[PDB]
Amino acid sequence: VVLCRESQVSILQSLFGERHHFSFPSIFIYGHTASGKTYVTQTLLKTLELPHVFVNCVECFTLRLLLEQILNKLNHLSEITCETFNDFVRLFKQVTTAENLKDQTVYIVLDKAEYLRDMEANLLPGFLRLQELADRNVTVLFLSEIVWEKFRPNTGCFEPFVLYFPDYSIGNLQKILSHDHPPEYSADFYAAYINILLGVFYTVCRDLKELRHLAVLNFPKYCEPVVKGRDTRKLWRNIEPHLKKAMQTVYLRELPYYSKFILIAAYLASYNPARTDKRFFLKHHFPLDRLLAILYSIVDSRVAPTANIFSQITSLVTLQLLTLVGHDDQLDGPKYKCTVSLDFIRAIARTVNFDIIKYLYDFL
Amino acid sequence: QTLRNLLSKVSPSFSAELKQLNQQYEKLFHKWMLQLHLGFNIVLYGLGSKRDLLERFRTTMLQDSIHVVINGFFPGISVKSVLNSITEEVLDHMGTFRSILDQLDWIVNKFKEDSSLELFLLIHNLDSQMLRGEKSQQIIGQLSSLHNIYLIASIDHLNAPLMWDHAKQSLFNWLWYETTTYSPYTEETSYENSSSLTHVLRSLTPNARGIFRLLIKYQLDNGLSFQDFYQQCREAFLVNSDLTLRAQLTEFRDHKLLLIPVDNGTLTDFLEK
Amino acid sequence: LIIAMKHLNDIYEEEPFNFQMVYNEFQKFVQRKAHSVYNFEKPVVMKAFEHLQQLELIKPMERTSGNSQREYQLMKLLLDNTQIMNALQKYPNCPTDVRQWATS
Amino acid sequence: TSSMSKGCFVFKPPIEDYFNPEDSKLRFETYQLIWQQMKSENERLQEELNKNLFDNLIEFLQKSHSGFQEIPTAALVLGVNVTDHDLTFGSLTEALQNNVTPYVVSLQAKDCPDMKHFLQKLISQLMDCCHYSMDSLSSWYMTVTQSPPVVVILKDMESFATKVLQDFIIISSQHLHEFPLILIFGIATSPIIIHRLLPHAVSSLLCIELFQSLSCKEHLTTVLDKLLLTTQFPFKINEKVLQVLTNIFLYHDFSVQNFIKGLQLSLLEHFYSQPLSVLLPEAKRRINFLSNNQCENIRRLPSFRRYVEKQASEKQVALLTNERYLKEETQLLLENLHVYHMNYFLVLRCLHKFTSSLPKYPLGRQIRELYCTCLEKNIWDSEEYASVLQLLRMLAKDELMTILEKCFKVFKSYCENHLGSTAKRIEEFEVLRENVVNFIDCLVREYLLPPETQPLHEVVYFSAAHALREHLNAAPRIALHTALNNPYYYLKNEALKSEEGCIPNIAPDICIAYKLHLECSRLINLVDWSEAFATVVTAEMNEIIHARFIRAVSELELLGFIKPTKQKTDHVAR
C-alpha cells in the first residue's frame, strides 16, 4: 500500500488511459533518495496488471546482458540471444506480435539509470525513440536521482516528459512510520515513540529507511521500563541517555615499536616544509633520505639499517597508511605521502611519550 | 667507449689473497646444498663479481640434476620468457598460454600432481631493471613457495631489501651469506649500454657537408631561424631553391641529426678531423 | 554547508576549496553562537559532504584517486547566489539563526 | 655456454649424505623427530586458541540464517600480523565446512582487479566447492540446491578497489531472495576504515557486526610457556639468542612464525656444530655405545675440565685415564642436570605466580621478562631483589591468602616430587608473613642458579648468537661500507694500515675511487675526478689509468652510488 501518494498515482493512471490507447514514448521520473520511486511504480504496475519488464541498470553492466535479460523476461511474460542494438530492434519487433501483446502497451521500467550515460553514446538516444523505430505501442520509463539537465546528449534527442516526486514532511513521515505498528502494544504508544524519535533526529536524518532502522533497533530499550513496572515522564527520564548515546553515531552503525617512529617521521616529513627541517633537528645553527635522516635524529638509540626496517616500510605501504607517488620501477628515488589523521598521530605519540606539537612548524 | 675493448690488458693486483679467499669460499657448497634440500632459499651478497663462484658451484655439484640458469643482467629478459622456457623444456609442453597467471596455475598444478620433479634455479643479478616489477617478484616467490624447487639468488644493488614485503619474506624463506670476491664486473657491464657523424657525412654530398659545417659553426658561435639560415646558405651558393634546402633538412632529420642534439666538444673535435 | 560554501566563494573569488576549510568555518559559526544545538562530530559532516557530492551539486577538478583523499580535494559549487536565496525563501522550516547567517 | 645473448639457459643430466657419519645420522634423525614434535605442538596450540571466537561465529551465522528460513556481515579485526592470517583462516574454514556449510570461498585482492575477473574466480571456485553473470550463479545455486547458504571470505580489502565492492554489494542486495549471501571481512587496521571505503548509500544496505581476535602477545607467551619452559623437550637456549629473538619480535613484526624459523635454524646449527649433541632414556642407552674419539672430545669440554679441576688428584687421574668410569660419571651428571631443569622450571613458575599480583610489576608481567632477567645474572645479587622482597612484605592478608591459594593450585597441579610441606605450611597459614617471605627467599637462593654454572651444559645449549644475527638480520649497507672503507679487515695487508679516513694509495682502484668521491662535493665532475684518480695512482700510461678509472666509475654506477645528471655535463649525485 501507499500512503501520502495520491497525486502522482492519479496522474499516472490518467496518463495510461486504456490498454489499447497509446502514451508518451519516454517519461523521466526524478526525485530524492527516500521518495519511494521503486515502491510506488512497482505497486502501481502490479495493481493495474500490465505487461511490464523491470530492469536494473547496475545488474546489466554490459549491453548484451541488458538486451538478453529484456528479451528473456519479455518472452517469459508472453532461449534468445542477441548482440547488436539493430538485432535487438528486429527481435523485439518479431516477439511483440503475440496476441497478448497485440493491442497493449509494453512498459520497460529501468531503475538506477545514472550509469546509462556511461555505457554507450547512442544507446540512450535509441531507447528514447524506441516507439518510433518499433512502432508497436511501446513505452519506456526512467528512474534516477540526477536531474534531466545532465542526461542531455550533445546532439539533442526526443525530450521525455519530466516528472518529480514530492519530498516528505513531518506528518507524512509520522504516518508512514506509525502505519506498521507492532500488534503487541497500543497504536498511541508507537505514535508517541515516532513523535519523540522525530523530535530528536529530524534535524539531520530525514531518510525514511534509516529512521525506520533506528526505530527498529531502539524499540526494545523503549519498551523495557513498562515491563519492569502510560507514564510519559518516567519513560522519557529512563530513556533519554540511551537516545543521546545513539545519536552520538547517526550514520556510522597496536603497531610494532619502530613502526610508530616511522609513522611519526613520515607525518613530520609530509606536513613540515623542508626549509625548517634543520631548524627542528640540526643541533647547531618527500624523498626517502629525508625520512631516514629524520628517523635517525628522533630516535635516541642507534638503529642499524637492517632489512627489517625496509620490510616495515613496505608493509606500511601495503596497509594503505603511506601512499607511493613515483613509478613502481623507480625504487631508488621513491616518493611517499602520509594519510593519517592528526588525532591518530597525537594518540600514537602519547603512547610513545613524544610531543609532536613542539615540532609541527604550522602550529608554531 | 670503443676503447673499452682494448682496456682488458691491465693486470690484476694482489691475486694471492683472492686465491685464498676463493679457496675459503669453496668449502660452503655442502652446507648450501643441505640448506637448499630442506626447503630454504639462499641469497648471496657482497662486493665483487660472484658469477665465477656460482659457475664453480654449478660445475662442481649440479652436474647430476636438472637445473636452470637465468642471468638476469641481460636487459632483454622477462619473467614470461622464464615461464616459457620452463614450460617448453622442464615439462616439454608446446601449447601457448592465454595469460601469465594461467601459465602459473598450470605449472603449480602440474608440480603438485607430480611429486617426482625437482628443479634448481641459478639467478644472476636478481636486482635487474627488468626483474624489479612487483608482479615479477610475486611470481618468483609463488614459484619458490613449492617444496620441489630450490633457489639461489644474488644481490648487487644497494636498495635490494625494499623489494621484499612481509608476505614475500614469508614466501621466499630467505637465508643470507656474505661472500665478497672483489672480482671485476666485466661481463655484467659488457651487455649494458651506457664516429657515427663522420661515417654518415663521409658518403653524403659535399654541399650537404658544407651546409652542416656552417650550421655547426653558427651553433658553436652562440638556434637558427629558417629565414636567416636560408639567406646564409644563399650566400655560400650551396642552395638554389628553398625546396632543395628543405629536402636536405629532411634528409638530415631522417638520420636524427633549429638545434643540433650533438655535444659541442664532439663537434669541435670533428671539425678539425 | 551550502551557505558556508557560498561564503567561501564570496570571500575567495572563483577559487576551489576542500572539506577542511568548510569544516573550520562551520565550527567558527557554531562556536560564535553561545549554546546552539549543533554539536556534531567530524564523521557525520563528512557523510553529509559525501551525500552532497553524490547528488552532483559539487564536481571535482582534474579527477584522481589514491594520491588525494576525499579530504584535501579541490571542489567547486555549481549554483548561483540568487538561486540559493530563492530556494531558501521557500524553505519550510528554516531557523532564524541560519537565515541571518546566510544574510550576513 | 652461460654467456650467450639469450638469457634463458637450461640443462639436463640420499638426504643424510649432504650432512657429512653414524653420529651424523643419529643427529639428523633426532633433528627430524624434534622438529616434527615441535610443529605438531604449534599446530595444536593454534587450533586450541580460537574456539571462543569460532563458536561465536557459528552461532552468529546460525542466527543470521534463521531469519532467511539487509545483508548480514561480520567484521573481524586481525591486527598487523600479516603472516598469521592464512594459518588462522585455514582453521576458520575447517570449522564452517565441518559444522554449518560446505560452501566456503576465500578470495584475494591481487587476483581481482576488475569485477569480471572477480565473478569469474568466484564462480570457478564455487564450481569445485561442491560470459558469467549473476543469473548464471543463481541458476547454479538452484540446480545444486534442488538449504545451505554460501560463505565468502574477503582477506585483504585494503588492496581492493572500492568500485567493484560497491557494485557487488548493490547487485547482491537485489537478489537476496534468490539465494542467501553472507560476507566475512578481514580488516588489519581499526574497523573505522570501513566507513572510509563504502559510501553511505551502499553502507546502509549492510548489517555489520564486530568481532575481535586474539592478541599476539598472549599467543607468544603461551607458545613460550608450552614449548620452552616445559620439561618435554631436551633442547635449551642461552640468554643471548633469547634476547635477540625477543628484540626482533617486539621491534619488527609481532609475528610468531619468524620466531619459529629462528628456533629451527638454531636447532639445525646446534646439531651441525657439536658432535656431542647426539645425546632421556635414549641418551642413557647411547652412553654405552660411546667411542674413544668422543671420549676425548668429552675430556676437552671447558665445563668438564673445570669440574675435573674441582675434584681431587686421584679422581682427576681416574677420569683422565679410565673410560667406563667417565661414562658413569657423565651419566650421573646428566641426571643431575635433568633434576636441575625440573626444579628450576617449577620454582620459576611458582615465583612468577607470586610476582604476578605485585603492583607496578618491578620484575615484569609475563614469563619471558622474569626468565631472561634471571638468565642474565643472579637476581639475589641485585638491589632490585631487595626492593621486590620489601614490596612483597606489604601485602594485605586477604590478597596474600589469594596468592597462596593460586600457588597451592600450582603445587597440587604439577609440584609432585619435592616439598609438599610447603603446601602444608601454606594451608597452616606479620611474623607469619615474614617467615613465608624468608622461606621464599631461601628457595630463591637455593634453586635459582644459572645453568652455565653446571658442567656438561654445552650439550643442551647453543651460544653462536652473532652468526644467527648475521644469518637472519643482514646489514648489506654496513658490510658494503666496511668493505669500501677499510679493506685491511678482508686482506690483512700491512700496506693498508695507515689511519681511519686517510687515503691509502696502495688500495685497489675501486676503494680509492670511492674514498676520493666521499670527500668531494655533492656533484662530481668526471674530468676532475679522473685527474685526481690519476694523481693518486701516479704516486700509454694515461690510457691505462683512464681505463681503470672508467671501470671503477662503471662499477660504482652499477652498485647505485652513482646517478648521472644532465644539468651539468659529467656530473653525478649521491
Ligand SMILES: Nc1ncnc2c1ncn2[C@@H]1O[C@H](COP(=O)(O)OP(=O)(O)OP(O)(O)=S)[C@@H](O)[C@H]1O
Ligand atoms: N510513499 C510511501 N508509502 C509507503 N511506503 C513507502 C513510501 N515511500 C517509501 N516507502 C517505503 O520505504 C521503502 C524504501 O523506499 P525505496 O523504495 O527504496 O525508495 P526509492 O525512491 O526507491 O529509492 P531507491 O531508488 O531504492 S535508492 C520502500 O520499500 C517502502 O516500503
Ligand SMILES: [Mg+2]
Ligand atoms: Mg528504489
